[PDB]
């Protein structure tokens, strides 16, 4: 009884969220019509974490979908599992996105914010308990980046105690899909730093690199890339849904991994990712998972951990396995590569074990780590921002919406300090 409320914003959020419910539905065993047709009693133990039951044997997710234009929403419902969602949780405007942060935050955001909060109020206050919220959005856009942060502030004000876990996609360094991203990401980071408890950063280029290097997929599509992300969000909450030898829920993760209030941006990775032909060679052992998780190529964020130093690290393991074997690897990986860990924090690696693995995979692993390598990713957006800012570039579109120029300087200064904050703790 640790219910979690799920919120999706924008084109990125709805497509990721829609694929996310396909993964959970098969894990719990829910037929796309919404009825249970599973195979084990353990599935019905704690389905209350994510689902509500309509009288008649039909289970409904605690999902709210938010957009400024209904174009992407109707594409989701036509999908196979689109019938699952409650029709009244579809909250949308009737105006163009604009791919603009200020317009999403001020012009269209204020109008829709009134209705979205009460829809949240329906699901948030309908359950016996509420541990935290779950947000999926991108930072380069205008709807997920702008409207998502607006709801994040209101959620914090009304529900301060609950954990506001968010999953974010960061603009790419070589080619990124929007010209005005340096403005959008810089403003969005200002809201994320002060409001959110946990933030995970995903880069599209790493997902392409992972699919081409490891899985040998000749033509990976956005369904397959979003499939990789769904595994990680499934992995974190699996401690709530199923029994284990050592439980580790969301609040345990935040306490252990976050040493100081502002340093909480995280990188993730998933093992085992097996090549379709390398499987005949790979004998799947516990050390084999340990090799993949800490391997730099498996990381889903395009920031190399070796260029920085680790502060904290966490690994989850799923399946019936030896508790000694997991604990020995954590000691082994920590002592073997001491050059990438901080001295003034011993035992930098947290561990956990879960009993039920994903279907087919007899064991699986999930990694979440925090490192000073995030200075690479912020220096990129700051360098692009300054040169776009030094001359008055596209700014006039944002100012016409009503944003004062002082907000950018406040936004960049807060971003600049967080870069320095990572620098000082490296010592």
């Amino acid at each position: 009884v640790r219910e979690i409320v799920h919120i999706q914003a924008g084109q990125c959020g709805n497509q990721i969220g829609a694929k996310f419910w396909e993964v959970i539905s098969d894990e719990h065993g829910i037929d796309p019509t919404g009825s249970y047709h599973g195979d084990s009693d353990l599935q019905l133990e704690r389905i209350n974490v994510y689902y509500n039951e309509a009288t008649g044997g039909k289970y409904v997710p605690r999902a709210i979908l938010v957009d400024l234009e209904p174009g992407t929403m109707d594409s989701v419902r036509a999908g196979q599992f689109g019938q699952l969602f409650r029709p009244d949780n579809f909250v949308f405007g009737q105006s163009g996105a604009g791919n603009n942060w200020a317009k999403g935050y001020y012009t269209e955001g204020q109008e829709l914010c009134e209705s979205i909060l009460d829809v949240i109020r329906k699901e948030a206050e309908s359950c016996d308990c509420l541990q935290g919220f779950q947000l999926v959005h991108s930072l380069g856009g205008g709807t997920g980046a702008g409207l998502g942060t607006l709801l994040l502030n209101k959620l914090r004000e009304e529900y301060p105690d609950r954990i506001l876990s968010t999953y974010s996609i960061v603009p790419s360094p070589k080619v990124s899909d929007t010209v005005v991203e340096p403005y959008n990401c810089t403003l969005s980071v200002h809201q994320l730093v002060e409001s959110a408890d946990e933030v995970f950063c995903i880069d599209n280029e790493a997902l392409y690199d992972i699919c081409f290097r490891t899985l040998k997929l000749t033509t990976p599509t956005y369904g397959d890339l979003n499939h990789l992300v769904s595994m990680v969000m499934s992995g974190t909450t699996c401690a709530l849904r199923f029994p284990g030898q050592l439980n580790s829920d969301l609040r345990k993760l935040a306490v252990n991994l976050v040493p100081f209030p502002r340093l909480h941006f995280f990188i993730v990775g998933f093992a085992p990712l097996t090549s379709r032909g390398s499987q005949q060679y790979r004998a799947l052992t516990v050390p084999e998972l340990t090799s993949q998780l800490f391997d730099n190529k498996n990381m889903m964020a395009a920031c190399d951990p070796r260029r920085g130093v680790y502060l904290t690290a966490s690994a989850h393991f799923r399946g019936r396995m030896s508790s000694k074997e997991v604990d020995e690897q954590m000691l082994n990986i920590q002592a073997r590569n001491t050059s990438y860990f901080v001295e003034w924090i011993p035992s930098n690696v947290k561990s956990a074990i879960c009993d039920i693995p994903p279907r087919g995979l007899k064991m699986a692993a999930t990694f979440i780590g925090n490192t000073t390598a995030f200075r690479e990713l912020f220096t990129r957006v700051d360098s692009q921002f300054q040169k776009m800012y030094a001359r008055r570039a596209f700014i006039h579109w944002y100012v016409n919406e009503g944003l004062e120029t002082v907000e950018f300087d406040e936004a960049r200064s807060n971003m600049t300090d967080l870069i320095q904050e990572y620098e000082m703790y490296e010592t």
Partner: protein, 48 residues
């Protein structure tokens, strides 16, 4: 609805929500009287 709306002039300034822990200057710790169990007698204090 009027209460929820946020004007541009009220932009979130830094440090409004991230509070800082004060640097902990301290009182001298009350060490040996903090426990009801008496301390061990020393080696040199033996009765002759």
């Amino acid at each position: 609805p009027e209460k929820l709306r946020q004007p541009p002039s009220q932009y979130l300034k830094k440090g409004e929500r991230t509070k800082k822990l004060p640097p902990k200057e301290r009182v001298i710790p009350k060490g040996n009287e903090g426990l009801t169990k008496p301390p061990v007698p020393k080696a040199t204090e033996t009765i002759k």
